[PDB]
Amino acid sequence: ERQKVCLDIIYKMMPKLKPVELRELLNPVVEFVSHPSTTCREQMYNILMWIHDNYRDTDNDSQEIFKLAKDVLIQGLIDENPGLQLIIRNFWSHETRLPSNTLDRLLALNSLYSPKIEVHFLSLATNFLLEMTSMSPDYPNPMFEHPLSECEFQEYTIDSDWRFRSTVLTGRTDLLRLRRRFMRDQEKLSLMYARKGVAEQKREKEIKSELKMKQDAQVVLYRSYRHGDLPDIQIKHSSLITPLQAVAQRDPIIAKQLFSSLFSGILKEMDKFKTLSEKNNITQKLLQDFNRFLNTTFSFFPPFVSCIQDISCQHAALLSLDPAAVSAGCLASLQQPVGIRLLEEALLRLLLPPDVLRWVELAKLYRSIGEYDVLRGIFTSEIGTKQITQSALLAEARSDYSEAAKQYDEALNKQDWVDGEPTEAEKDFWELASLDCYNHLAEWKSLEYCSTASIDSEKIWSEPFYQETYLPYMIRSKLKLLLQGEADQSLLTFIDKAMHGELQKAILELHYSQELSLLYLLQDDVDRAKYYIQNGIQSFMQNYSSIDVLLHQSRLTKLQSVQALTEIQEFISFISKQGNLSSQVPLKRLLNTWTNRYPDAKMDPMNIWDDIITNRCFFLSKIEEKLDISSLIRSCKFSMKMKMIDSARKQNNFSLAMKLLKELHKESKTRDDWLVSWVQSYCRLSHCRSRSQGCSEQVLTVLKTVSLLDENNVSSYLSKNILAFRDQNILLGTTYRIIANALSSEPACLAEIEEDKARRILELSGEDSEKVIAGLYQRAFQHLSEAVQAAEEE
Amino acid sequence: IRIRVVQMLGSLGGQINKNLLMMKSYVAWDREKRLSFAVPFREMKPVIFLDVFLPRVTELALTASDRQTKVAACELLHSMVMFMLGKATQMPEGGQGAPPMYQLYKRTFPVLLRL
DNA sequence: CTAATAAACTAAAAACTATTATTAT
DNA sequence: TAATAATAGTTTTTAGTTTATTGGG
């Protein structure tokens, strides 16, 4: 009552006010959007449309009032009440707000944008541009004046029910007013009991009514259907446009391509009769509009960004967007390759070449998609100013990120430039590639080096666009730092101040909510962690609905993401629900089982990997601190880490966690089996370590101390399976073969020339190199044979 | 239902989950724009092509949740198919005497019959 | 050869608002 | 099914001690 009367106050009194008092009054008013009652919402909408119409021109402050009014209107273009949506659509669709010309409608919809309704603007624009197409003379008329043949096209009605298939097998009324209240020959409290009983039956009637209403609302069609034996082509244009706009408001992607088609067709029809000067000027206006759209958006919905860059693709004059903006949108929204063609054709049309910006953007996007061939195929050109970048990328093509990080660091720290200073974009490439390779270098030290507050002293560290790129890397660094058993509260304070500021907080939940969930688990804020994680998973599955089927790789990455999401949510789904302090439920004995579910081997790069193990170990730590069991959790993490190192060796990320392996050996003396398994892991890794310099490399470290002198308990004195025994025989024969081949290929190696313990052990295992290679080949044959007879014993 | 699906799907295993996805499974549905439609207007009228719509609306009305979306997409595709057959009967093209949407017929008849 | 006692002191109860459950249907 | 009638919460006296204050004998 009071809110409604106050809005009516404002509505009646504001037509007699100064702009300054209006701007004073609107700030404590406009925020009443998202009020639980809708009626106040359309009341303020009436106020907003009034001032919108009254403010058109002058004073820049009244113009600011006008800007804020259209802003609150356009963000009001979504309401839960469909009637509000209908009335605002009717208001905006009028010729005054949006002029009836199609190109006028286009420029008007360009004039309006909001960063938050970027999900729905495509559908809204399609609805605006199609429902307006209703005053065309042929619009009620059928498309085809001819029928197929003679037939009776009687209408075929269609039913509708909440039930589905597979449910059943087989003042003239004064008599009423005169007889309404003849209470006199009745009792009062008996009538009271009747009234309250009737109230009770109405209560359970409401109960069953809401039980029925639990299901979806009844589906309504949008086109009358006639019936006949021959199809009736002669049907109105409404019959196809109305389902088209309906499904456009249903699905975003179909709205995407139909919007693209209508945009391309309308431009291809407008160009035929307008002067080239006006068409050109309109084209730059559009280009500015799209640049504004991409700069202002934050939640990069793949359909919207992809459709705007796609409609820019079809027109040569539209190949002039801010290419860095295009690159950022494509990488963030995972719509990369089409934007790659955008950059390519913009380069192609533009034809001294300053295209280094397009080059660097396409190169970083190709690095994002994973491949490396285009990178070198491009930077082998003279346009590549710094060949250090080319050398770094070709050398890390074998997943050698350490040297690439070294090259990036020395390049950014190379102040002198005899060949000319590199462009800012090239240095941005270098630092972002260093960030990505450090992300591959799963250790927290690389992450801290990322978080070393880069040059120019870089919420405080969020506003510039370079910082926007760093924020995911920065927070990933911070969480990997803290979750491993570290505490600084700097990240907590940062996200607390990031709550202040709607845009920063908004982007961090809409993209990175599981980070909030995990840190709230760190603070034991299980409720808000659950809220964040459910928000993340539902938003992400919505994105999976949004992404197209062609790009398998993005869907794969999303798949691994939601895999990690489900392990963390099932962890939070079992904390003390049954009560777990001394109740040794098999759940703990079951969650570790199946190798603590599938670790997703042989693919799924290392960031998935270390996230999985880090969260799992932090979990089991939380249980054991809130609950022989330690032996079980140690064995579990042992298995986790062995699967890790084996898979990452299969990943050929040969810059493995060396010191992690060293400490695995260091406290590998839990039982013999554990240290034995570590020994086989290390020796197999060194076996795979053979490379171009695998000759000198393998002869300098011949499985360190010759299989680490493992000749004490083979298969734990054969007490284990002889499959293990045949495994060590295989490894020993393998390293014998590698050394013998290395010596045969390089009889004059420096290491064998060098008088060292390697010389002693090689002559022991063997004078002349021929005798040594014959002896080592004999030993290799012997050990491989031993593995062979140990093999057949199943 | 959907949250259960996604959570347990993740719980299965990522490479195991990969089995949801080899002749590349898509190139195009036509070698040229065999079908087009001119949207009317009070002013001049541009031309739109249904071919880009055809496949994705086909699976969208084939199988999905949100029965409202299913019904709306079905109604749209029925209006679509009536319009395209009428256009084919209107002015036949060449190449096979009249292959208007012949390959497209080969694609649409299976989806029509299974829906 | 041993005091009412004036003042100080806390206690206790009434007066005046004083909104706040509280039935009817 | 949705009202109004009891109705506590601050001042403010006032009795109820208490005292610490003399000369009594």
Swiss-Prot record, chain B:
It is linked to Immunodeficiency 26 with or without neurologic abnormalities: A form of severe combined immunodeficiency characterized by reduced or absent T and B cells, recurrent candidiasis, and lower respiratory tract infections. Some patients show dysmorphic features, severe growth failure, microcephaly, seizures, and impaired neurological functions. This is DNA-dependent protein kinase catalytic subunit. The chain holds residues 851 to 972 of 4128 of the full protein. It comes from the Eukaryota. DNA-PK is a heterotrimer of PRKDC and the Ku dimer (composed of XRCC6/Ku70 and XRCC5/Ku86). Formation of this complex may be promoted by interaction with ILF3. Component of the core long-range non-homologous end joining (NHEJ) complex (also named DNA-PK complex) composed of PRKDC, LIG4, XRCC4, XRCC6/Ku70, XRCC5/Ku86 and NHEJ1/XLF. Additional component of the NHEJ complex includes PAXX. Following autophosphorylation, PRKDC dissociates from DNA. Interacts with DNA-PKcs-interacting protein (KIP) with the region upstream the kinase domain. The modification Phosphoserine is found at S36. Belongs to the PI3/PI4-kinase family. Autophosphorylated at two clusters, the T2609 cluster and the S2056 cluster. Autophosphorylation induces a conformational change that leads to remodeling of the DNA-PK complex, requisite for efficient end processing and DNA repair. S-nitrosylated by GAPDH. It is found in: Nucleus; Nucleus, Nucleolus; Cytoplasm, Cytosol. Serine/threonine-protein kinase that acts as a molecular sensor for DNA damage. Involved in DNA non-homologous end joining (NHEJ) required for double-strand break (DSB) repair and V(D)J recombination. Must be bound to DNA to express its catalytic properties. Promotes processing of hairpin DNA structures in V(D)J recombination by activation of the hairpin endonuclease artemis (DCLRE1C). Recruited by XRCC5 and XRCC6 to DNA ends and is required to (1) protect and align broken ends of DNA, thereby preventing their degradation, (2) and sequester the DSB for repair by NHEJ. It comes from Homo sapiens.
